[PDB]
């Protein structure tokens, strides 16, 4: 889990699989945004804050309990996720995203505006596993309804 | 049999040879005694005593020990 | 080499004192002939043909290539 104070165990998790970093949007094309006055600066700051709040609210609106991303996110999004009781994990690899989506029976969503309740996966238990005196942590997603993907842990 | 370069080691070899020539026995006790004497002289030197004084004291003590050996000896047939 | 086990050379006592005095005497003798009205100037060649005809002690000591620490002390003095 991205925040150290986030809960280490989620039961009956409704997972929102996302491939969009929890960051303000940026076009792929070479783009320059011009700030020409104090009003422009204030509008830009308000826009960034509102984008963070809006993406968090959009994730929360679907009723999801867990959020899984692929490209990580920054501090404001992390604290908003912690504040809204949404455990989250970041920088999950592409194959891992695909396996989680297959196992939990949920769709991979490319942006928040497309997130819906029907695209949420389900997992009976999502847990963070410790391995003794090693400081390393791993996440276990299991107890799926009709999981079509398995993992062998040796 | 030893192959040495240090001159003090050669002196010890010659001391063993001398003990072998004169007596024929005790060629190991001489080396141990000399090593112990020099080891004690080391800590005596660390306290600021002239090595000639150490040698003179050693000679005096050796005279005393030889006289004691003469005193405590026994005669065999 | 020895029990100290320091990667370098060590000089102690009269040897190092004589070395320091020798370096100081060398520095003094370099400029001793340029003192007083009957003193004489010097040519200094800077390895590329640059010539410095000087009588000042500071100039001579700065232009020279000095390696010993005591000699450096006198030059900076």
């Amino acid at each position: 889990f991205s925040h150290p104070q986030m809960p280490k165990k989620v039961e009956d998790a409704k997972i929102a699989i996302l491939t969009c970093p929890f960051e303000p949007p940026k076009p792929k094309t070479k783009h320059k945004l011009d700030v020409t006055s104090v009003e422009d600066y204030k509008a830009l700051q308000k826009y960034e804050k509102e984008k963070f709040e809006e993406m968090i609210q959009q994730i929360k609106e679907t009723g999801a309990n867990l959020a899984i991303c692929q490209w990580g996110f920054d501090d404001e999004a992390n604290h908003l996720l912690l504040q809204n009781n949404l455990p989250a994990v970041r920088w999950v690899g592409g194959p891992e995203i695909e396996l989680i989506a297959i196992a939990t029976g949920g769709r991979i969503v490319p942006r928040f505006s497309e997130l819906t309740a029907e695209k949420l996966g389900f997992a009976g238990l999502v847990q963070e596993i410790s391995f003794g005196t090693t400081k390393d942590k791993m996440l276990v997603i299991e107890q799926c309804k009709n999981s079509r993907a398995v993992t062998i842990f040796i | 049999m030893m192959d040495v370069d240090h001159q003090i080691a050669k002196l010890m070899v010659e001391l063993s040879k001398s003990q072998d020539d004169e007596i024929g026995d005790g060629t190991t006790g001489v080396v141990v005694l000399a090593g112990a004497l020099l080891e004690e002289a080391e800590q005596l030197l660390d306290r600021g005593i002239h090595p000639i004084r150490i040698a003179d004291g050693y000679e005096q003590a050796a005279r005393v020990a030889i006289e004691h050996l003469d005193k405590i000896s026994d005669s065999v047939l | 080499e020895g029990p100290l086990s320091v990667f370098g050379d060590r000089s102690t006592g009269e040897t190092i004192r004589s070395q320091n005095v020798m370096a100081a005497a060398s520095i003094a003798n370099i400029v001793k002939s340029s003192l007083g009205p009957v003193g004489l100037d010097k040519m200094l060649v800077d390895d590329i043909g640059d010539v410095t005809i000087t009588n000042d002690g500071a100039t001579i000591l700065k232009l020279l290539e000095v390696e010993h620490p005591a000699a450096k002390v006198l030059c900076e003095l």
């Binding site: - | 001391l15 090595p51 050693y58 050796a62 003469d70 405590i72 000896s73 | -």
Partner: protein
């Protein structure tokens, strides 16, 4: 060399020698149960011990008087 504690056994033997006047008490190396070396028949010549002490003392004095070494240091093959 016999597997006993050196300081303890030597101190005990020395104390026994002081207590009862008997210079024949020594180290029981063979573990015969007695320290009286006369009963064990461990006998060595008086001249051998005297020569040991004399030679060790003279060599130690001779070594103690050397205060300078001048080696070629060439490390020839």
């Amino acid at each position: 060399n016999s597997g006993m504690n050196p300081i303890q056994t030597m101190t005990e033997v020395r104390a026994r020698q002081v207590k009862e006047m008997n210079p024949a008490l020594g180290i029981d190396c063979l573990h015969k149960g007695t320290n009286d070396m006369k009963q064990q028949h461990v006998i060595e010549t008086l001249i051998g011990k005297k020569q040991q002490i004399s030679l060790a003392t003279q060599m130690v004095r001779m070594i103690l008087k050397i205060d300078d070494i001048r080696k070629p240091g060439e490390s020839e093959e």
